[PDB]
Design a protein around this nucleic acid. Structure first.
Ligand SMILES: [Ca+2]
Length: 224
DNA sequence: TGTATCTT
DNA sequence: AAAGATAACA
């Protein structure tokens, strides 16, 4: 096998792979790759499944869709692998972390794997993008798939913190039982929207408050 | 030059 | 659906 989709996630989501919408979606993505550059590369569409067991997810960060520039997106929302510098969205995330978490210091890179390993699911609502065109693969099938991810977690986990960043991610909110999980919503951290509430949202400290109240270990946001 | 959300 | 307006900053 290719080992692209983590095993505990495949166990609970592989049913989607036999559904017409998903078969047609992956066909659409393959047709796009034939004529255009699509991000992330094929082996990294599902990196978000490879960092921790699905049963160990404690926090879900949901963005819009992947970065659309060369060598940026690698399947963890808002993350970029070294040596690529943090894009403007991630610099804004770091800026809010710096005011929200007193101990947080800019790490010098943009790889968020260290949050994902602690059980922060770094998901985007749409999981591919045509180069240079933000949200170009919306409404093609990804939303049903990431709905299935959110629905599984909603039903099988307890006390999750969902952070829905941007209008497209917030479409998932209706699916989440608010008396069982915690949903925090704010604007996307892109410079094009950050001033609509992201700065000052304090989601990182709020997340840890909620985890600690429910007996769970907080996220160490400096562990990158 | 580039990186959302609203209105028509 | 999508063009354009609105939006803040480098
Ligand atoms: Ca991304």
């Amino acid at each position: 096998g290719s080992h692209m989709f983590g095993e505990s996630w495949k166990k609970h989501l592989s049913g989607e792979f036999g559904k017409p919408y998903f078969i047609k979606l992956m066909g659409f993505v393959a047709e796009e790759r034939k004529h255009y550059t699509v991000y992330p590369p094929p082996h990294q569409v599902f990196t978000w499944t490879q960092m921790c067991d699905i049963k160990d997810v404690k926090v879900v960060i949901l963005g819009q869709d992947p970065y659309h520039g060369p060598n940026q997106a690698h399947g963890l929302c808002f993350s970029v692998q070294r040596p690529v510098p943090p894009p403007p969205s991630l610099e804004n995330i770091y800026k809010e972390l710096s005011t929200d978490i007193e101990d947080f210091v800019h790490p010098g890179h943009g790889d968020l794997s260290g949050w994902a390993k602690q059980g922060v699911l770094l998901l985007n609502a749409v999981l591919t993008v045509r180069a240079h065109q933000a949200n170009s693969h919306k409404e093609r099938g990804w939303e049903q798939f990431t709905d299935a991810v959110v629905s599984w977690l909603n039903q099988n986990s307890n006390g999750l913190v969902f952070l829905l960043w941007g209008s497209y991610a917030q479409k998932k909110g209706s699916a989440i039982d608010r008396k069982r999980h915690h949903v925090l919503q704010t604007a996307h951290p892109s410079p094009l929207s950050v001033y609509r509430g992201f700065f000052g949202c304090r989601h990182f400290s709020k997340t840890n408050e909620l985890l600690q109240k429910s007996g769970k270990k907080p996220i160490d946001w400096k562990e990158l």
